[PDB]
Design a binder for this molecule. Structure first.
Ligand SMILES: *C(=N)N1CC(F)(F)Oc2ccc(-c3ncnc4[nH]cc(CCOC)c34)cc21
Length: 281
């Protein structure tokens, strides 16, 4: 629950992003290099709202207990009472994005659908706890094992007040626009309904095995052509969508098309999506 910085022997960097970073540390009090491995998140440079946003990320993940959400192990303190580091479980297989590229000859559509089912189930749970992820993408999903995935990175995640079912953000979204729904693009509105849209892009990502050539960014920019955001909005408002991934089963592509309904209230819920994905196995 509380990790001492003196017993957290740093190994490598696991990745960087959103004013902070994740480090592969070893929690070994004995100082012998024989202890458990943990994923440790800090901010590379602290800020005003940055420290508050990180503090909220910790609260959110502390309160999330699902087989499809990366486990919170605790915190490591410095000043009183600023929670300097966030300690999570270490999933050696890392990102689904990189795992997909590395193992695509081994992973069939059955396995891709299992992943989808698990990502969906975890999003069902988030929605149940009034949590908008706001940054669902294959880069933000982790691999526990060959048949197990968990949703990670809650750095942009928000909690819906009980009176409101949508959330309007002020600061522009510094994440690739290719995952945002039109209402996020145009009016900075985020919901479980926008997370569903971003899930369709995750299904796209899965069935393209995160190929860089037909990636959401690569393929939309190719379709585009004015500011880039405006060009994307025009495209999607005309009803233009990402093409069917090569060799993708039609039923899956149809589910992507569904997640990509222009209006948020026409998109299926994760509760509704889940058994549909289970039908495909
Ligand atoms: C995936 N290969 N990466 C690269 C990246 F996206 F830049 O950043 C990452 C940070 C951390 C991990 C990660 N790897 C292993 N165990 C983990 N537990 C929690 C996290 C955080 C996920 O942050 C996106 C990890 C992977 C990547």
């Amino acid at each position: 629950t509380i990790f001492e910085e003196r017993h957290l022997k740093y190994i490598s960097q696991l990745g960087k992003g959103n004013f902070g970073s994740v480090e592969l540390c070893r929690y070994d009090p004995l100082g012998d290099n024989t202890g458990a491995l943990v994923a440790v998140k800090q901010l590379q440079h602290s800020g005003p709202d940055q420290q508050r946003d990180f503090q909220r990320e910790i609260q959110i993940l502390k309160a999330l207990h699902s087989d499809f959400i990366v486990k919170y192990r605790g915190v490591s303190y410095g000043p009183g009472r600023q929670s300097l580091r966030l300690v999570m479980e270490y999933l050696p297989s890392g990102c689904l994005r990189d795992f997909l590229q590395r193992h695509r000859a081994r992973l069939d559509a059955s396995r891709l659908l299992l992943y989808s089912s698990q990502i969906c189930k975890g999003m069902e749970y988030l929605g149940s706890r009034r949590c908008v992820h706001r940054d669902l993408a294959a880069r933000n999903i982790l691999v526990e094992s060959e048949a197990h995935v968990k949703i990670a990175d809650f750095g942009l995640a928000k909690l819906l007040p009980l009176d409101k079912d949508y959330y309007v953000v002020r600061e522009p979204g510094q994440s690739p626009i290719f995952w945002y729904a039109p209402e996020s693009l145009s009016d900075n509105i985020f919901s479980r309904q926008s997370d569903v849209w971003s899930f369709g892009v995750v299904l796209y990502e899965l069935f393209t095995y995160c190929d860089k050539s037909c990636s959401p960014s690569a393929e939309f920019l190719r379709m585009m052509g004015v500011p880039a955001l405006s060009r994307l909005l025009e495209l999607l408002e005309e009803g233009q969508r990402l093409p069917a991934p090569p060799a993708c089963p039609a039923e899956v592509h149809e589910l992507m098309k569904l997640c990509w309904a222009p209006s948020p209230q026409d998109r299926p819920s994760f509760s509704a999506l889940g058994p549909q994905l289970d039908m495909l196995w």
